[PDB]
């Protein structure tokens, strides 16, 4: 069997995976290896989305957030030449028993000193653009509004965030989406309570930058919010706070290309959290083994900085990873007329493998 | 080529509202942020605040968010400021400014040729 | 944030160097900008992202620095550089700007 590399464009002094193609070729026993040459680009574009929970638990963070985006691209500056940010919001799903359904307090779903916005599960508040002067704005005009249990519904509008690609104005660059909250977080079967069976199919329901189809879907399973994550490049950053890290950090093992971070009780160090986290996430290369089964199976040895090498699950992941750092992927598909595909998670830049066997 | 053509120069009376127009043009309107620059005779500069034609959302400084109601119009690929409230201290000259390419690069590459508004009485 | 850009204004002679300061109330991660302002027309920029080239500005011209500290070098003048001289800063809001040096040449 042979590598048959093909399109290896040499990683740039933008490429930052080479060969960004090739053919191997063989079945039972295969070992084909193709050394990943993962050379981590410096000024490569990020957009990111900031997804904040706007519940009245974080009515003081909201006022840390208004100053985010132009504060995020100057610390971004160093790392990447060109970025974007956009703002959501969610609070929860607006019916009982999420919510008090009184005519009075629907207005207001916290108490009567209180005021609150009637609730929304999500709002498009601003789309991906180059100017966080928008994003300060459109964050500051914005509402604080409350629920009534300590949980809040942030996986719908997760996944609203990722799906609507044109309508949030995802690029293709490497996507962060920052998901803030105090509090726990509400998932699929928490719907049952207030009688909403059906589960978030993962579309695109935003009329009016609004997520009005609160009412008729359920949070999504971390499973599916973990799908809709990685099949759009987007690296979630759960800045959640310090009672409920045990929660998210245990989260963070199951979602691919996380980093969860502690905060103050206002967010303070918000954007220091999103800055570590990223170092963590481009420092680190979680190949995907894209999608493909049955008669293929691949086998993962990393070369990183400082000579450590992982084995399987630990062979895929790398750490340590300088700027314009150049680390060594024994990728060897096993297998055990198809062109899948293998991406860094995080990454639309691609390498093509095709299993002509 | 990049080019910022203004109206002409303005004249406007104290307490009432002057438009002063931007017909940008060799560029998307929508997409770069539009900011005016005031900059009075023999002064500096002074950042006045931000139109955005894409969502139509507008932010200023603490001296012009109240006064100066910036808008934008998509089809004409025109700005306007209304300058609510004039005061015959404001009579200057007046900058649509557009941004290196935006991000970090907030750099006000583009200026117009000046709108010399002459509020007076 | 405000840039009290150095200095108020100077004259030199034809050829010098001259290096122009904008120092920042805080670091600013090469987030400055230059413009020149001939009188009676709209400011041009000069340098962007504190270290490059505008197009069309001569070679003479050249941004360095990092953090909070940073410099406008012209590599000798010429009657084509008159003009007032303003730092604009990209880190916070309102933008700031910078005094503005008259770099107005001598005989």
């Known amino acids: 069997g042979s590598k048959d590399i093909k399109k290896n464009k040499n990683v740039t002094n933008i490429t930052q995976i080479q060969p960004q193609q090739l053919v191997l070729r063989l079945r039972s026993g295969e070992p084909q290896t193709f050394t990943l040459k993962f050379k981590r680009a410096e000024d490569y574009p990020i957009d990111l989305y900031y997804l904040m929970d706007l519940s009245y638990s974080m009515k003081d963070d909201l006022e840390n957030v208004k100053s985010l985006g132009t504060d995020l691209m100057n610390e971004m500056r160093r790392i990447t030449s060109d970025f974007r940010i956009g703002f959501g919001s969610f609070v929860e799903k607006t019916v009982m028993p999420y919510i008090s359904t009184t005519p009075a307090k629907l207005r207001n779903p916290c108490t009567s000193e209180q005021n609150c916005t009637s609730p929304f599960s999500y709002k498009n508040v601003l789309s991906l653009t180059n100017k966080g002067e928008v994003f300060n704005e459109l964050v500051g005009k914005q509402r604080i509004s409350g629920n009534l249990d300590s949980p809040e519904g942030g996986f719908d509008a997760i996944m609203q965030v990722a799906v609507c690609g044109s309508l949030i104005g995802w690029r293709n660059v490497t996507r962060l989406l920052v998901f803030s909250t105090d509090a726990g977080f509400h998932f699929a079967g928490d719907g049952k309570l207030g009688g909403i069976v059906l589960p978030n199919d993962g579309q695109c329901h935003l009329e009016n930058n609004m997520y009005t189809m609160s009412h008729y879907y359920d949070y999504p399973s971390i499973a599916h919010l973990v799908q809709k994550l990685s099949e759009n490049n987007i690296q979630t950053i759960f800045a959640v706070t310090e009672e409920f890290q045990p929660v998210y950090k245990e989260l963070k093992n199951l979602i691919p290309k996380s980093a969860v971070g502690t905060l103050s009780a206002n967010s303070s160090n918000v954007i220091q959290l999103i800055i570590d986290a990223y170092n963590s996430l481009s420092s680190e290369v979680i190949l995907e083994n894209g999608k493909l089964s049955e008669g293929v199976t691949i086998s993962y040895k990393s070369y990183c900085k400082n000579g450590v090498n992982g084995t399987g699950e630990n062979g895929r992941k790398c750490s340590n990873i300088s700027i314009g750092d150049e680390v060594q992927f024994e990728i060897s598909i096993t297998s055990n007329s198809d062109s899948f595909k293998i991406r860094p998670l995080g990454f639309t830049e691609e390498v093509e493998v095709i299993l002509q066997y | 080529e990049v080019q910022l053509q203004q109206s002409g120069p303005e004249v406007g009376r104290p307490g009432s509202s002057v438009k002063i127009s931007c017909k940008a043009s060799?560029?998307?309107?929508?997409?770069?942020?539009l900011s005016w620059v005031k900059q009075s005779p023999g002064q500096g500069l002074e950042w006045i605040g931000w139109?955005?034609?894409?969502?139509?959302?507008?932010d200023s400084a603490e001296k012009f968010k109240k006064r100066a109601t910036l808008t934008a119009d998509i089809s004409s690929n025109t700005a306007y400021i209304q300058l609510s409230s004039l005061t015959s201290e404001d009579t200057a000259t007046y900058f649509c400014?557009?941004?290196?390419?935006?991000?970090?690069?907030?750099?006000?590459?583009?200026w117009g040729q000046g709108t010399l508004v002459t509020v007076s009485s | 944030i405000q840039m009290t850009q150095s200095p108020a204004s100077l004259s030199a002679s034809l050829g010098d160097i001259v290096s122009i300061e904008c120092l920042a109330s805080?670091?600013?991660?090469?987030?400055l900008a230059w413009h020149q302002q001939k009188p009676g027309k709209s400011p041009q920029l000069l340098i962007y992202?504190?270290?490059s080239l505008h197009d069309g500005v001569p070679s003479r011209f050249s941004g360095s620095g990092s953090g909070t500290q940073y410099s406008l070098k012209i590599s000798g003048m010429q009657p084509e550089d008159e003009g007032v001289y303003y730092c604009?800063?990209?880190?916070?809001?309102?933008?700031?700007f910078g005094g503005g040096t008259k770099l107005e040449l001598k005989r």
């Open positions: 604009q800063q990209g880190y916070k809001y309102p933008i700031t």
């Open positions: 060799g560029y998307t309107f929508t997409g770069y942020i």
């Open positions: 139109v955005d034609p894409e969502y139509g959302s507008t």
């Open positions: 805080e670091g600013i991660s090469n987030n």
């Open positions: 400014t557009r941004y290196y390419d935006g991000y970090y690069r907030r750099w006000f590459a583009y």
């Open positions: 992202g504190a270290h």
